[PDB]
Amino acid sequence: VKMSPLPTVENQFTPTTAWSTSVGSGIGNFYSNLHPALADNVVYAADRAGLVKALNADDGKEIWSVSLAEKDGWFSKEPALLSGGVTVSGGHVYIGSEKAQVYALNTSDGTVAWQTKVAGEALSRPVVSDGLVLIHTSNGQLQALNEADGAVKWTVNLRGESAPTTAFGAAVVGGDNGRVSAVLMEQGQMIWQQRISQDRLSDVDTTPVVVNGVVFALAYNGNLTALDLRSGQIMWKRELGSVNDFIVDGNRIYLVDQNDRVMALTIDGGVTLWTQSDLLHRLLTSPVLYNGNLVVGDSEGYLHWINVEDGRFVAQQKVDSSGFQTEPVAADGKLLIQAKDGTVYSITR
Numbered sequence: 001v002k003m004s005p006l007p008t009v010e011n012q013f014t015p016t017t018a019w020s021t022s023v024g025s026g027i028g029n030f031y032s033n034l035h036p037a038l039a040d041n042v043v044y045a046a047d048r049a050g051l052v053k054a055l056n057a058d059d060g061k062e063i064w065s066v067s068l069a070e071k072d073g074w075f076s077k078e079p080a081l082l083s084g085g086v087t088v089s090g091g092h093v094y095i096g097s098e099k100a101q102v103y104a105l106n107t108s109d110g111t112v113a114w115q116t117k118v119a120g121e122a123l124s125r126p127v128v129s130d131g132l133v134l135i136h137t138s139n140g141q142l143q144a145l146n147e148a149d150g151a152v153k154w155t156v157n158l159r160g161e162s163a164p165t166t167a168f169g170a171a172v173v174g175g176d177n178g179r180v181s182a183v184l185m186e187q188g189q190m191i192w193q194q195r196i197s198q199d200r201l202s203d204v205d206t207t208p209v210v211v212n213g214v215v216f217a218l219a220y221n222g223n224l225t226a227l228d229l230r231s232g233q234i235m236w237k238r239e240l241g242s243v244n245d246f247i248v249d250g251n252r253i254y255l256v257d258q259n260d261r262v263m264a265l266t267i268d269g270g271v272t273l274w275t276q277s278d279l280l281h282r283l284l285t286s287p288v289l290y291n292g293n294l295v296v297g298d299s300e301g302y303l304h305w306i307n308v309e310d311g312r313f314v315a316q317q318k319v320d321s322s323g324f325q326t327e328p329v330a331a332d333g334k335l336l337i338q339a340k341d342g343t344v345y346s347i348t349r
Contacts, residue, residue, distance in 0.1 A: 001281070002280075002281060003280075003281040003282055003283075004260075004277075004278060004279055004280040004281060004282055006300075006302065006316075007278045007279070007304075007313055007316065009304075009313045009314075009315065009316040011314075011315045011316065012314045012315060013314070013315055013349055014315070014317075015303065015305065015315050015317045015347055015348065015349055016317070016347075016348055017319060017345055017346070017347060017348075018060075018345075018346040018347065018348040019058075019059055019060035019345070019346050020060060020320075020343050020344065020345045020346075021053070021055055021060035021061070021062070021343070021344050022341070022342055022343050022344075023045045023046065023047050023051060023053050023338070023342040023343065023344055024046075024047030024048075024049050024050075024051035024342050025047055025048070025049055025341070025342055026047045026048065026322070026338065026339065026340055026341045026342025026343065027047065027048045027325070027326070027340055027342070028048065028340065028341075029340075030048060031159055031203075031325075032048060032083055032325070032326060033083065033084055033123060033124060033125065033161040033326060033327075034046055034047075034048065034082060034083060034084070034085060034086070034326055034338070035085075035086070035125075035326040035327045035329060035338055036086065036329050036336045036337075036338050036344055037085070037086040037087055037088040037093070037329070038057060038088075038329060038331045038332055038334060038336060039088040039089075039107070040107075041056070041057040041058070041332070042054050042055065042056065042057060042063060042107070043055040043056075043057050043060070043336060043344060043346075044086045044088055044093050044107075045086060045338055045342075045344045046082045046085065046086055046095055047082065047342045048079070048081060048082055048083070049069065049079045049080065049082075050067050050068035050069040050070075050079055050080030050081075050082055051065065051066075051067050051068075051069075052065065052066050052067075052068060052082070052086070052093065052095065052105060052110065053065045054093075054107070054110060055344070057332075057334060057346070060344070060346060064109055064110035065110060066105065066110040066111070066112075068080040068082065068095075068097075068103060068112075070099075080097050080099065080101070080103075081097045081098035081099050082095050082096075082097050083096060083097055083098045083121065083122065083123045084096035084097075084122045084123050084124045084125050084126065084135075084161075084163075085125050085126055086125070087125045087126040087127065087128060088107065089128035089147070090128070090147060091106065091107050091108070092104045092105065092106065092107065092113055092147065093105040093106075093107055093110075094125075094126035094128065094133055095126070096118070096121075096122025096123070096124070096125075096126060096135060097121075097122060098121045098122075098123065099121075100117055100118050100119070100120055100121055100122065100137070101115055101116070101117060101118070101122070102115070102116050102118050102122055102126065102133070102135055102145065102150065103115050104133070104147075104150055113150075114149055114150035115150065116145055116150040116151070116152065118135050118137055118141075118143055118145075118152075119137050119139065119141040119143055119155060120137030120138050120139035120140075120141055121137060121138035121139070122135050122136075122137055122138070123138050123161065123162075124136050124161045124162050124163040124207070125161070125163045126163075127163050127164045127165065127166060127171075128147065129166040129171070129185065130166075130169070130185045131146065131147050131148075132144040132145065132146065132147065132153060132185060133145045133146075133147055133150075134163075134164040134166070134171055136162050136163060136164050136173050136175075140157065140158045140175060140176065140177070141155055141156070141157060141158065142155070142156045142158060142164060142171065142173055142181075142183065142188070143155045143156075144171075144185070144188060153188075154187055154188035155188070156181075156183050156188045156190065158173060158175050158177070158179065158181055159202070159203055160202070160203050160204045160205055160206060160220075160244075161205045161206070161207055162174055162175060162176075162205070162206040162207055163207040164207075164208075165207060165208045165209060165210050165215075166185070166210075167210040167229060168229075169184065169185055169186070170182050170183060170184055170185060170191060170229075171183045171185055172208045172210060172215055172217075172229070173208065174196075174206035174207060174208050174217045174218070174219075175206060176206075176220060178195055178196055178197035178198050178219055178220055178221075179193050179194065179195050179196070180193065180194050180196055180208060180215065180217050180225075180227060180232065181193045181194075182229075182232060191232075192231060192232035193232065194227055194232040194233075194234060196217060196219045196223070196225040196227070196234070196237070197219035197220060197221050197223060198221075201242075201258040201259065202220075202221075202222065202242065202244075202258060203244050203258070204218050204219075204220055204221075204222055204242075204243070204244055205218065205244060205245045205246075205286060206218055206219070206220065209246070209247070209248050210229060211248045213228065213229045213230070214226050214227070214228065214229060214235065215227040215228070215229050215232075216246070216248055216253070218243050218244075218246065221242060222241065222242025222243045222244065222257070222258060223237060223238060223239050223242070223243075224237070224238045224243050224246065224253075224255070224269060225237045225238075226268075226269060236268060236269050236270070237269075238265075238269050241257050241258075241261075242257055242258045243255050243256070243257050243258070244256055244257060244258055244284075244286070245285075245286030245287065245327075246286075247286070247287060247288070247289070248267070249289055250267075251266065251267045252264055252265065252266065252267060252273070252308070253265040253266075253267060253269065254287055254289075254294055254308065255287075256284050256286065256287055256296060259277075259280055259281060260279050260280050260281055260282050260283060260284045260298075261275055261276065261277045261279075261280065262275070262276040262277075262279065262284070262287065262294070262296065262306060262311065263275045263276070263311075264308060264311065274310055274311035275311065276306060276311035276312070276313075278313070279296070279298065279304060282298040282299060282300065283298055283299035283325075284296045284297065284298055285297040285298070285324050285325060285326065285327055285328055285337070286327045286328075287306075287328075288327070288328045288329065288330040288335070289308075289330060290328075290330040290335045290347075290349075291349050292308070293305045293306060293307060293308065293314055293315075294306040294307075294308050295328055295330070295335065296328070297319070297324030297325075297328055297337055298323070298324060299323045299324065299325065300323055301318065301319050301320040301321050301322060301323040301324055301339060302316060302317065302318050302319065303316070303317050303319055303324075303328075303337070303347065304316055317347075319337070319339070319345055319347070320339035320341070320343055320345065322339045322340040322341035322343065323339060323340050324337060324338075324339055324340070325340055326338055334346060335347040335348075335349075
């Protein structure tokens with residue numbers, strides 16, 4: 001109901017915007033999981049309409065760009081509805097769309113290496129492993145495409161993102177029905193399935209996270225479960241409260257629930273170390289670790305920096321008026337985030 005006010009923070013440091021660069025019209029008022037990718041000092045980002053850009057990671061200046069708008073149809077130009085991604089790997093930029101297409105672009109010049117029709121809407125980021133691009137579709141399919149030519153090697157029938165995760169030769173996918181699946185990457189052979197379950201604030205990221213032989217996954221209802229990677233056997237479940245996003249680091253789980261409470265939990269999920277509720281109903285992005293702090297954005301376009309030991313705020317900063325939604329990205333010493341209007345920011349502690 002009530003969005004919390006902007007907390008009063010005594011900054012312990014003063015984070016600023018290193019640069020910003022627009023990317024078309026971004027995602028607008030639509031829900032999306034589209035976010036930036038970073039590789040070898042180049043930022044790759046897109047908008048829903050079909051514009052993809054490659055940018056210098058130091059100053060945000062465009063290196064290349066391409067419009068994936070479908071100009072083959074009744075109207076001379078139709079939106080691509082880019083939705084899942086961006087993912088970069090092995091000289092390719094991969095992006096999925098609500099129109100059941102997956103694009104592979106060359107990192108060198110933005111040109112289309114290949115485009116493949118997939119079995120359903122691709123709303124989740126491509127995940128690349130073992131020479132295959134894994135695509136979890138919105139209608140319960142997992143397809144593996146060859147990185148080289150985008151051919152569908154195998155298909156396995158099984159709001160919110162649900163990308164696959166990979167570990168030791170297997171893919172693990174969460175999903176709508178409340179089942180988590182493990183599938184061998186070679187030929188998509190099913191190894192095991194496990195049921196982990198069985199409304200307006202519900203935006204659950206059901207992407208599994210695999211850490212040292214444990215699969216941590218959220219159910220469609222927001223319950224967090226831990227399963228043994230190899231067997232799918234359930235190790236523990238927190239039927240407490242409803243979680244939207246989480247990350248794992250060391251012996252800790254950091255999460256943001258449907259009310260926008262931020263928490264730290266022990267890795268066995270048996271204990272809440274702390275809860276920070278000062279951002280209640282501010283509609284937070286998923287969290288990320290940067291410079292040792294937990295960072296989240298909100299729908300009003302502020303970034304909040306949180307101490308992982310006690311949950312207190314250490315810094316705050318206004319960034320973009322269109323507001324944040326998709327995930328911040330922390331990689332190669334950089335912090336990147338894309339606002340709803342499409343504008344991509346680099347943030348410096």
